[PDB]
Amino acid sequence: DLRLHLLLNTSVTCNDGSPAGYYLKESRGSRRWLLFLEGGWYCFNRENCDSRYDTMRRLMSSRDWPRTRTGTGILSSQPEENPYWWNANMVFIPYCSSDVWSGASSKSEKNEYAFMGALIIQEVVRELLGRGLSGAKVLLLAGSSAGGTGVLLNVDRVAEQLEKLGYPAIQVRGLADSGWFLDNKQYRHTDCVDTITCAPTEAIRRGIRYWNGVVPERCRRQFQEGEEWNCFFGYKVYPTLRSPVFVVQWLFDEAQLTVDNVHLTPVQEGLRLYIQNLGRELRHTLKDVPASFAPACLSHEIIIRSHWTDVQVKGTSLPRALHCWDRSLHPLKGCPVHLVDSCPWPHCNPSCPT
């Protein structure tokens, strides 16, 4: 189990002003640290944040969080379940800011909610330095879904923070799972007139203003004022980053299909071509990403699932690919790091989740 610690700086808060926090399991013999960012969509105006507060309150508040959580998948401490990093120091950071980990605003007379995701990450890192992180050799910032996008948005800021604090020996790296989305044309189209009809580019542009959202500096300088929404799309932000980042993305991600207005309920020609083109576009965006794992499956998230070791690309599992990545950062005979399926339809890979 990992144990809850609420932040000592109580000005760094969840949406409703309750303190943010993290769950920790230490491993005294290890200089590796894994910090995992939870996902779970986002909200972008008063009305849709109010509805999320009624029925997804744990994603907006710490008031009802449990004292412990069980580590699963890459957060498991058993080698049977986690061949990659079972002996690491483990940290799970709950997602309670509804801002794709980008916000820097407090609750105030002008703001019903606080959006502090970018500041939560910085405050967790600062408080962990006194609990053993000061001795680390590697800090892997990982995450799934909105947390995977959060890795892309925050990994270089963590590296800069540690350099300015006097810890240049800590190697900061990123692992982004199920957070690599396309701003493509939808299968069916609606103008942004409410929450369900608002496409991701329009919803994120509104969110950034509502959250006071922040993006990495080199990406911000490319796209400039009013266009920072571009930095939430992995294929645009990734080439601006300096830290090493491993990208995990299903070629037919269920959240991508949802935002494209596709619902697989017999598939006719128009939809068959749409799905095949989506897989080809995703593959194209990964061509120049040297550390990547992209199976041809219809699914969502991988790294904290208990059976995460089962899926393989070209005969190599994800825990193996991550180990090969570690070796590469010290090509390798029989230890590959670039693993992207080429077959064109979901479940053409027999190891896909059932």
Ligand X SMILES: *[C@@H]1O[C@H](CO)[C@@H](O)[C@H](O)[C@H]1NC(C)=O
Out of 1, 11, 165, 329, name the contact with ligand X by CB under 6 A. 11
- Which is nearest to 339 in space by CA: 349, 330, 329, 353? 349
Query: How far does Cα 187 stand from its chain's mean position?
Result: 25
**Is residue 108 close enough to count as binding ligand X by CB under 6 A?**
no
Which part of the chain contacts ligand U62 (CB under 6 A), choosing from 36-44, 130-138, 277-285, 315-323?
Answer: 36-44
189 is catalytic: no
Q: Is 20 in the site for ligand X (CB under 6 A)?
A: no
145 tagged catalytic: yes
Residue 137 CB neighbours (<10 A)? 11
Please give the Cα distance from 249 to 125 (Å, whole number): 26
CB of 12 to ligand X, least distance (A): 5
CA 145, 247, 293, 263: dihedral to nearest 10 degrees? Answer: 30
The answer to whether 22 touches 36, Cβ cutoff 8 Å, is no
Of residues 177, 253, 260, 341, which has the active-site annotation? 253
Q: Which of residues 39-78 bind ligand U62 (CB under 6 A)?
A: 39-41
* Nearest in space to 4 (alpha carbons), one of 25, 31, 29: 25
Q: Is 129 exposed, middle or buried (0-12, 13-18, 19+ CB in 10 A)?
A: middle
Judged by CB, which is closer to ligand X: 123, or 228? 123
Please say which residue, 118 or 159, places its beta carbon nearer to ligand X. Answer: 118
223 near ligand U62, judged by CB under 6 A? no
- Write out the two tokens for 129: 């330095």
Q: Is 96 in the site for ligand U62 (CB under 6 A)?
A: no
187 binds, among ligand U62, ligand X, none (CB under 5 to 8 A by kind): none
DSSP 8-state symbol, 25: E
30 is catalytic: no
Does 124 help bind ligand X (rule: CB under 6 A)?
Answer: no
119 sits near ligand X (criterion: CB under 6 A) = yes
Name which of 81 and 177 has its Cβ closer to ligand U62. Answer: 177
Measured from the CB atom, is 116 or 302 closer to ligand X?
Answer: 116
Say if residues 60 and 98 touch (Cβ distance below 8 Å).
Answer: yes
Return the residue matching tokens 């990994």.
155
Residue nearest to ligand X (CB): 9
Only one residue has tokens 């779970």, namely 40
**82 interacts with ligand U62 by CB under 6 A:** no
Judged by CB under 6 A, does residue 9 bind ligand X? yes
Hey, is 47 helix, strand or coil? helix
Least Å from the CB of residue 250 to ligand U62: 12
Query: What amino acid occupies position 245?
Result: V
Is residue 93 within the footprint of ligand U62 (CB under 6 A)? no
Q: Does residue 181 interact with ligand U62 by CB under 6 A?
A: yes
- Is position 111 an interface residue for ligand X (rule: CB under 6 A)? no
Which does residue 232 touch among ligand U62, ligand X, none (CB within 5 to 8 A, set by kind)?
Answer: ligand U62
Structure tokens at 332: 């390798």
Tokens describing residue 270: 């128009």
* Residue closer to ligand X (CB basis): 69 or 126: 126
Choose, from 99, 300, 317, 338, the residue flagged as catalytic.
300
- Residue 87, contacted partner among ligand U62, ligand X, none, CB below 5-8 A by kind: none
Q: What are phi and psi of 258, to 5 degrees?
A: -60, -50
Alpha carbon 8 to its chain's center: 25
Phi, psi of 154 (to 5 degrees): -120, -15
Residue 49 tokens, joined = 């944040």
> Active-site residue numbers?
145, 253, 300
Per CB under 6 A, residues contacting ligand X are 9, 11-12, 119, 123
Per CB under 6 A, residues contacting ligand U62 are 39-41, 100, 145-146, 149, 181, 200, 204, 232, 255, 259
